[PDB]
Amino acid sequence: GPAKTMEEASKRSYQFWDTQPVPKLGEVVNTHGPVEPDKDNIRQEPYTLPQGFTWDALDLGDRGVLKELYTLLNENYVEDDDNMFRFDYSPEFLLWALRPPGWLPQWHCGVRVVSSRKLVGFISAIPANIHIYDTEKKMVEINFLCVHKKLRSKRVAPVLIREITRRVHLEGIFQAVYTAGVVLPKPVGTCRYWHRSLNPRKLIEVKFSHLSRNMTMQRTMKLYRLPETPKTAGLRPMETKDIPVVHQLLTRYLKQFHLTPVMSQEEVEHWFYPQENIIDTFVVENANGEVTDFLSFYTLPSTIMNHPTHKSLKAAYSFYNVHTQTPLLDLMSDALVLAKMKGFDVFNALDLMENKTFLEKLKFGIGDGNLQYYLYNWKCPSMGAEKVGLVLQ
């Protein structure tokens, strides 16, 4: 019994989340700080799982183990509200997302069946320095919580959350950030996905989108057509020499928002250096040889469930887009062109940061369902979407 809307979660009882150091859904926060003090002694034993299941840390360096995690997520991870599409994170993408600088093996927390060794559960943590209003804290980002469909509704998720919390406490970290499509106590910000059609015909045949009332298929295709090459002078793929200036541009650009990452130069290399079918970053090198802007988006296809002909939807996701001399509008226009060129069906972006200044103008359509942002063990006022400056995978 999850809840997707904010007053529909008001009518729900949070058996697990009431035990956790997060503000209450009804609470209004007029303070800044930890919900509870750091614990100076941490439980040494893993939480007990139901009979027949065992903890196992996943060495994603082992190709076979990574493939098992890919399959668990491919078959059991997040679906849309209509049960028509499911995320299809690739093995190489998962390596990018789960082994950034500072990753730890015990933070790749798997659950297996004792008898068959089948992987049936997972949760992960990666370290991240997080700027939240006037405070900068070392935290973890929690992602990829997944319970096999046959194991659902058996209170396994609370055990995964408690166990990753324990393993993070053991390393001296007491705050986390995470996002979810469901409402939990208590969102620090609520964002919304918008979508930009790139291959409208594919998207309508698979019922990802639909013909708007009184608009034909030929008009819709014409409406979404794009130039074949980008417009901005000096746009080119990010290279190794660009790492310091990309770090500099991002650091200065993020100061205007209230929830942001604080990345080292090594983390900027990890998150932005282009990897085919994972992450794309283009910089603008101007007529003086200076890099003044960059755009980026990551690759995340979805399975199209129960369709005889179309099996996968190739989606691009807006990542971080920094502008200091090129208009954001022109930057995102080139991102759409580049995505189209690279074979993507759709371009997704949230309404956070300054994205609302281009969403409507570039013919994005609003999606359904939100993306809620949460902090664990940190009290602070909520913020509008335009002040969220954090994008997770």
Partner: peptide
């Protein structure tokens, strides 16, 4: 990503 969306 985490929340699967489609145009309303």
């Amino acid at each position: 990503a985490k929340s699967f969306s489609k145009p309303r």
